Design a protein around this ligand. Sequence first.
Ligand SMILES: C[C@H]1[C@H](C)CC[C@]2(C(=O)O)CC[C@]3(C)C(=CC[C@@H]4[C@@]5(C)CC[C@H](O)C(C)(C)[C@@H]5CC[C@]43C)[C@H]12
Length: 222
Amino acid sequence: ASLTEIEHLVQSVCKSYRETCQLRLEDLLRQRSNIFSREEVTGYQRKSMWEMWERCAHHLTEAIQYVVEFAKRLSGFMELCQNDQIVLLKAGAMEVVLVRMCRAYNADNRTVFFEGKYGGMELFRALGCSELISSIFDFSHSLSALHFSEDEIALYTALVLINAHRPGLQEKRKVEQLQYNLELAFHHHLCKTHRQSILAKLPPKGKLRSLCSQHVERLQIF
Ligand SMILES: C[C@H]1[C@H](C)CC[C@]2(C(=O)O)CC[C@]3(C)C(=CC[C@@H]4[C@@]5(C)CC[C@H](O)C(C)(C)[C@@H]5CC[C@]43C)[C@H]12
């Protein structure tokens, strides 16, 4: 690569993400005072466990649609094999969705956006795994504690998928090359932004996996 490709790619990554940022950040924060009420909350609480889990899967799956198309615009991804273009997504794509959830997270009230409004963890009282839900909130918290920006998201999220160490890969070299020119662009852009400090304030590599992995297993009931 070259000093300019280095820039060209970040911009290209900041490009692809913007198209796939699912929701307008602009519109997101604006809806602060729009908060659920006890009755509606008490309403949502009432439904059986069978309903919410599915309701979640809607917002979930639909969100993951964006995550995939994000992967495409990226260089070298297109010139990758059929078998190997999926393997990463299998593990990766789930994890990224959770990452984007931080945007819908406000630490000033411990709530997350959902179905038009913001709501606390008690909105999922009916899921029977309060511990699970909470850990996700605690994950979002740490990310909100990072005061994260769009263009680092685009760059973090990208490396999640491009893990050449995801087992089941056949064309292993080609991906590492994508990874190397991705690992570089991130830090490089971070160094250009002096945000290298948060790199020690980042989740361990096993946490987000252990989150999503153990997350989907309970879901693998439906
Ligand atoms: C990921 C974001 C997306 C960036 C845009 C906002 C989002 C949406 O599309 O509505 C808000 C709701 C959550 C956070 C979203 C989808 C999944 C989550 C999820 C179901 C994730 C799994 C968790 O267990 C939990 C139940 C806390 C959330 C609920 C909020 C939801 C349903 C969307």
